[PDB]
């Protein structure tokens, strides 16, 4: 029996007494804090596993950003870093980590669009910072006959983060709906690795969101 529901709330309004999105975010933050504590105090010169999180992820992400947009990466290092180590962590917490919305007794609409607004801030402030009038370049200029949609492209840039927020709200919510459907019919996950496919899709989506933020920054650069 399908019992799925939408957990849409208002970020501007105060938190609800249940606050499912806030509860999951707090759980993900607690898990990340525990992981960081297990690798900060118990850290060695060549730690295995404890320093592997910093090396194979944080250092790898920094190297990838430098290969994509070096120097600019240093300016927006935390911007993608905060995008990373989160959402995915929430997806893992949201990938039926125990109750899995069953016998309890990123999908959040506003949370995603708030992150999109934060990404817009990357273009609002750091964006074209090196030019200032860079937002007005190739937009209804003297060559505007060849750049008439250049403003529309900025409008696309105005919709690129929100659509990314849609990617954050979507897929994550879809995965939960698929899990609920598998619970309602054909129990014990599915013939395909439904839990594994959902986890892989969530990780790939978080990585794609980070790469999309980096690529939006690079496109804003030139």
């Amino acid at each position: 029996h399908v019992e799925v529901a939408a957990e849409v709330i208002f970020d501007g309004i105060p938190g609800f007494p249940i606050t499912n999105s806030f509860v999951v975010a707090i759980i993900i933050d607690i898990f990340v804090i525990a992981l960081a504590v297990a690798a900060t105090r118990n850290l060695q010169m060549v730690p295995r596993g404890l320093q592997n999180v910093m090396e194979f992820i944080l250092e790898s992400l920094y190297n990838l950003f430098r290969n994509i947009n070096a120097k600019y990466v240093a300016t927006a290092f935390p911007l993608v870093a905060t995008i990373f180590l989160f959402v995915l962590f929430g997806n893992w917490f949201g990938l039926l980590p125990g109750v899995g919305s069953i016998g309890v007794c990123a999908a959040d609409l506003n949370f995603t669009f708030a992150i999109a607004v934060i990404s817009f801030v990357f273009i609002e402030y750091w964006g074209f910072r090196a030019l200032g009038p860079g937002y007005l370049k190739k937009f209804f200029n003297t060559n505007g006959i060849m750049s008439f949609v250049g403003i529309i492209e900025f409008i696309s840039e105005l919709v690129k983060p929100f659509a990314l927020a849609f990617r954050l709200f979507g897929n994550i919510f879809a995965g939960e709906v698929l899990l609920v459907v598998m619970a309602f019919l054909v129990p014990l996950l599915l013939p395909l690795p439904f839990y594994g496919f959902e986890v892989f899709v969530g990780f790939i989506q978080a990585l794609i969101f980070a790469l999309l933020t980096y690529a939006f920054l690079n496109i804003a650069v030139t």
């Binding site: 975010a25 960081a36 900060t40 910093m54 944080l58 935390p78 870093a81 905060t82």
Partner: peptide, 25 residues
């Protein structure tokens, strides 16, 4: 809530960034 976790992760990474830089040298 996102900003506080972001700052905590930034401090944790800055410590890991310092450790990685020390290891590189």
């Amino acid at each position: 809530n996102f900003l506080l976790l972001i700052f905590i992760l930034r401090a944790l990474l800055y410590r890991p960034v310092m450790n990685l830089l020390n290891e590189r040298t």
